[PDB]
Amino acid sequence: ISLPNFNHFSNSVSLAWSQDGSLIFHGFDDKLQILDFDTFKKFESLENTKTVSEFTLDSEIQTVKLINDTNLIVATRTTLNAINLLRGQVINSFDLYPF
């Protein structure tokens, strides 16, 4: 159990799971979290190569889905973004607003 207690409430929540069980993506409103599984803490990297566990996004996140251990597609309420996991570099982006 990881138990925060947020005073706000927004059900726009989702989570994805790394295929080996290492980490947990957590799509929260305007926020992407990465959670270690062994301690339910954020992804602490000692090398500090800015693959951080807190990503800012524009709107409420709807889906976060990993296609493998390398590619992650997130669909937030206004758009979609396709990013890598070995490197924290954005690849693709498409608009969801007009539809």
Add this chain to the structure above:
Amino acid sequence: HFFFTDKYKPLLFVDLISSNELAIIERNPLTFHSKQKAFIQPKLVF
């Protein structure tokens, strides 16, 4: 001119006791002394 009231549907005896004091002598037949057990036919309330 005249009148008639509907406030006294059970009544045994009406008279003038005095100059103006009336006597309306009613009945409470079922609610008071009989209390006869009626057959239970319930109304579907919901």
Add this chain to the structure above:
Amino acid sequence: VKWCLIIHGGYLVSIPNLMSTLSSLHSTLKRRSDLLPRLLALDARLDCTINKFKTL
């Protein structure tokens, strides 16, 4: 329980697994705090009708 926490609080600071060692206490106390507010609503309705029939 109040006196246990009062006279041995610091040992419960030094123990690492508070939830693991008083899950049952926390569960019962949480249940009572959950019963609290609806009970107070009951109390408001209760003394409402109580003073209502007391004045009439």
Add this chain to the structure above:
Amino acid sequence: DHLSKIFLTISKSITQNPWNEENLLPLWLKWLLTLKSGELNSIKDKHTKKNCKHLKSALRSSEEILPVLLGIQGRLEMLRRQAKLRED
């Protein structure tokens, strides 16, 4: 409907001062509700009821405040007993 005007002013003043330590205005509201609540509900449908939902939101905020306050009250009683055992 002087009682209704009284209820209007009492509700407005109570919304303006939610944390007033006085008791006379809340006990007036108490007696007025536990006496004439149905006719109070059948006075008006728009403005008095908007005042009712406003005051009910404020008092619900007070209800949200209450249990944490009880928790710190227990913390302070425990700390007072700790101070007593520190003296003895």
Add this chain to the structure above:
Amino acid sequence: ELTLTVLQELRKRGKVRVALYGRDESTLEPLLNWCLKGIEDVRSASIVADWVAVVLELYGNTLESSPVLQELMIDLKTKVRHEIHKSKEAQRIEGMLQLLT
């Protein structure tokens, strides 16, 4: 627990108003006897609160006309203030547990 179950299932299936429509004082009093036995229990208090709330909001003035049911409400007020004190002290103990964690 069996009375608790049938209370739950009556409240869930039907409504407590149709459960309590044609009541008099002699059939109100075993309900309230079970209440004075079982409001003190953690598991049932919300359900018993629902039932006593709907029966008071139905039988407001018959409460006045029947005298011993008033005394039931008095001792109910006393024991429910006892539960007030118990639950408030419980929230206090929860606060000091939050201190000690």
Add this chain to the structure above:
Amino acid sequence: VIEKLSALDIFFKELKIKEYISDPGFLNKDLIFGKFSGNTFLLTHPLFRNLLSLLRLFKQAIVTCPNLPLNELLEELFSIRNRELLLDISFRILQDFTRDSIKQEMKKLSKLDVQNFIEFITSGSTQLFQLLSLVLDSIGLFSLEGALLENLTLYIDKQVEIAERNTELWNLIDTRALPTYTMEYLDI
């Protein structure tokens, strides 16, 4: 858009002249470079460099900044300006971070600001009371004044009496034939 931001439709024209879901969807699909070049439009970007955000728009950040650290957040909180920033930043920290993280941060925090905050709340809001819970659980049990304890005691007691009475008022606003002989009159 990147070229416009470097050389610097509505926001673009505004930036060019000065030199929001639709805005977010049109300008969030490079972004870090744009934010660095930027550091109104900043407010919109905030709505859509945590040290920079902390060193800095004050209200816009304390309601809608994406990255905000606990240390500068508690420093801005224990600024005793109190322009409703107490309730604002209390909601902000209870939204953003965990109770144990706030506990260890207030363990880091010096005791003098704690005592000043206790004096300020006792002299002149469930987020605030949860913050008092948190600050009590972070200071622990030993170092705290008895006189300040008694002032907080009378404060919390009068507040819990008015809270109880308030809850009772809240739920309170949430709430045979003729006798054997009567004497009645008649009209003509």
